[PDB]
């Protein structure tokens, strides 16, 4: 709404400035405005959108974890009653986080995903959808937790199916999707064996395809392969 009067190109320019200034809330607002112009996003623009919201929600998740840890400690035996404030403030942060997730999911549903026909764009958006449902799942404790988890799983699965048919095993989007879906399995779905299998198979299939790549493509792919290895090391 607030960005309705600003040119699409100006919003994109300002998002890039906001990134340079580490003003990620501004960056996300600019990119939301750009999406709401209704035109499809280029690859560079999709990256700006994802970076902005990743940074905003990343900060909220880190804060939520600090507060949840304090709250958990407050409910241990021998802990002095300090009143409702810790729960209230964790709830405040949680609600803000859920709001950001809902905003991103809204942009994806209205109408980024439905207009995305190329594998690279569709997989990228479906990965995002899985990611923001995963963040909702991290804080979910109620009646809809199972449905939230399943929404993440379904988005990731659709992205996986397309990526396996349409993209090479070294494609950074395919790799990043697999990395994140593997984390979903480990941290959300209580499926560490699936997480480990996915990370290993993804790594090994990428390794076998590196020979086809330029130096620059090799750099991109191997960076994400190292993240897969890092997680495997953490988990084994």
């Amino acid at each position: 709404g607030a960005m309705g009067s600003m040119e699409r190109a100006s919003l994109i320019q300002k998002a890039k400035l906001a990134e340079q200034a580490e003003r990620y809330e501004d960056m996300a607002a600019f990119m939301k405005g750009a999406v709401e112009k209704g035109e499809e996003l280029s690859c560079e623009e999709r990256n700006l959108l994802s970076v902005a919201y990743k940074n905003v929600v990343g900060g909220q998740r880190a804060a939520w974890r600090v507060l949840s840890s304090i709250e958990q400690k407050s409910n241990e035996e021998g802990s002095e009653e300090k009143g409702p404030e810790v729960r209230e403030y964790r709830e405040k942060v949680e609600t803000e986080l859920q709001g950001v997730c809902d905003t991103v999911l809204g942009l994806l549903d209205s109408h980024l995903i439905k207009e995305a026909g190329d594998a690279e764009s569709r997989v990228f958006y479906l990965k995002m959808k899985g990611d923001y449902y995963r963040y909702l799942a991290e804080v979910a404790t109620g009646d809809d937790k199972k449905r939230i988890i399943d929404s993440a799983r379904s988005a990731y699965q659709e992205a996986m199916d397309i990526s396996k048919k349409e993209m090479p095993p070294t494609n950074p989007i395919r790799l990043g999707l697999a990395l994140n879906f593997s984390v979903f399995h480990y941290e959300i779905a209580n499926s560490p064996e699936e997480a480990i299998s996915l990370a290993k198979t993804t790594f090994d299939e990428a390794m076998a395809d590196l020979h086809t790549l330029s130096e620059d493509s090799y750099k991109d792919s191997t960076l994400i392969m190292q993240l897969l290895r890092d997680n495997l090391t953490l988990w084994t």
Partner: peptide, 5 residues
Amino acid sequence: FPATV
């Protein structure tokens, strides 16, 4: 915490 992108 594990790596995501």
